Coordinates of C-alpha atoms in Angstrom, one line a residue:
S22 CA -9.7 87.8 59.7
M23 CA -9.4 87.4 63.4
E24 CA -8.5 83.7 63.0
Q25 CA -5.5 84.8 60.9
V26 CA -4.4 87.3 63.5
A27 CA -4.6 84.7 66.2
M28 CA -2.4 82.3 64.2
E29 CA 0.0 85.2 63.7
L30 CA 0.1 85.9 67.4
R31 CA 0.9 82.2 68.1
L32 CA 3.8 82.4 65.5
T33 CA 5.1 85.5 67.2
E34 CA 5.0 83.8 70.7
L35 CA 6.8 80.7 69.2
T36 CA 9.4 83.1 67.8
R37 CA 10.0 84.6 71.2
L38 CA 10.5 81.2 72.8
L39 CA 12.8 80.0 69.9
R40 CA 14.9 83.2 70.4
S41 CA 15.5 82.3 74.0
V42 CA 16.2 78.6 73.0
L43 CA 18.7 79.9 70.3
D44 CA 20.5 82.1 72.9
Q45 CA 20.8 79.3 75.3
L46 CA 22.2 76.9 72.6
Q47 CA 24.6 79.4 71.4
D48 CA 26.0 79.9 74.9
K49 CA 27.1 76.3 74.7
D50 CA 29.5 77.3 71.9
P51 CA 31.7 79.7 73.7
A52 CA 34.5 79.3 71.1
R53 CA 32.0 80.6 68.4
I54 CA 32.9 77.7 66.1
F55 CA 29.3 77.6 64.9
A56 CA 28.5 81.3 64.8
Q57 CA 28.9 82.0 61.2
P58 CA 28.7 80.2 57.8
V59 CA 31.7 78.2 56.7
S60 CA 33.4 80.6 54.2
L61 CA 33.7 79.2 50.6
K62 CA 36.7 81.5 50.1
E63 CA 38.5 79.7 53.0
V64 CA 37.1 76.1 52.4
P65 CA 36.5 76.1 48.6
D66 CA 35.5 72.4 48.5
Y67 CA 32.9 72.7 51.2
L68 CA 29.7 72.3 49.1
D69 CA 31.1 69.2 47.5
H70 CA 31.0 67.7 51.0
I71 CA 28.1 69.3 52.7
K72 CA 24.9 69.8 50.8
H73 CA 22.9 71.9 53.3
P74 CA 25.3 74.2 55.3
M75 CA 23.9 75.7 58.5
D76 CA 25.2 78.1 61.3
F77 CA 23.8 80.2 64.2
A78 CA 23.7 83.5 62.2
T79 CA 21.7 81.8 59.4
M80 CA 19.3 80.4 61.9
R81 CA 18.9 83.9 63.6
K82 CA 18.0 85.4 60.2
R83 CA 15.3 82.8 59.6
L84 CA 14.0 83.3 63.2
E85 CA 13.7 87.0 62.9
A86 CA 11.7 86.7 59.8
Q87 CA 9.4 84.3 61.8
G88 CA 10.5 81.5 59.4
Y89 CA 10.2 78.6 61.9
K90 CA 6.6 77.4 62.0
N91 CA 7.2 74.8 64.7
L92 CA 10.0 73.5 67.0
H93 CA 10.8 70.5 64.6
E94 CA 11.9 72.9 61.9
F95 CA 14.2 74.8 64.3
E96 CA 15.7 71.5 65.6
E97 CA 16.3 70.3 62.0
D98 CA 18.5 73.4 61.4
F99 CA 20.3 72.9 64.8
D100 CA 21.0 69.3 64.0
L101 CA 22.4 70.3 60.6
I102 CA 25.0 72.5 62.4
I103 CA 26.2 69.5 64.4
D104 CA 25.8 66.8 61.8
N105 CA 27.6 68.8 59.0
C106 CA 30.6 69.4 61.3
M107 CA 30.8 65.8 62.4
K108 CA 31.0 64.6 58.8
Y109 CA 33.5 67.2 57.4
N110 CA 35.8 67.1 60.4
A111 CA 37.5 64.0 61.9
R112 CA 37.1 62.8 65.5
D113 CA 40.5 64.1 66.6
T114 CA 39.7 67.8 65.8
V115 CA 38.6 70.7 68.0
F116 CA 35.6 71.2 65.5
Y117 CA 34.2 67.7 65.9
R118 CA 34.7 67.8 69.6
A119 CA 32.9 71.2 69.9
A120 CA 30.0 69.7 68.0
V121 CA 29.7 66.7 70.3
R122 CA 29.7 69.0 73.4
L123 CA 27.1 71.4 71.7
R124 CA 24.9 68.4 70.9
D125 CA 25.1 67.0 74.5
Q126 CA 24.5 70.3 76.2
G127 CA 21.9 71.4 73.7
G128 CA 19.8 68.2 74.2
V129 CA 19.0 69.4 77.8
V130 CA 17.7 72.8 76.5
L131 CA 15.7 71.2 73.7
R132 CA 14.1 68.6 76.0
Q133 CA 12.5 71.4 78.1
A134 CA 11.7 73.6 75.0
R135 CA 9.6 70.8 73.7
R136 CA 7.6 70.5 76.9
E137 CA 7.0 74.4 76.9
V138 CA 5.9 74.4 73.3
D139 CA 3.4 71.5 73.9
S140 CA 2.2 72.9 77.3
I141 CA 1.6 76.6 76.2
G142 CA 0.4 75.3 72.7

């Protein structure tokens, strides 16, 4: 139907905007601490601690399959990256501190993304 095509076009345009948001958030992680999944070979207990692991590569795979239907879903995955790290790692660590800085800098980006999503529809 044409209505289905129009819905598909809207999902495609959201995907474009989320790809630009993702790029901008990932630039706030210049150490690449959050680029890839925590390796269970290197951290064999991880899934005892963290029940829903997340990282920027995993988000990019979901995005490219148009698997984010709205900005809330995207933000949920970004918050998992941060919140997982801040639980597993202590305050005194470069990992925790990178997560704080990514959260603080990412908030700015997400605040304007929300306005664009609402504005454009």
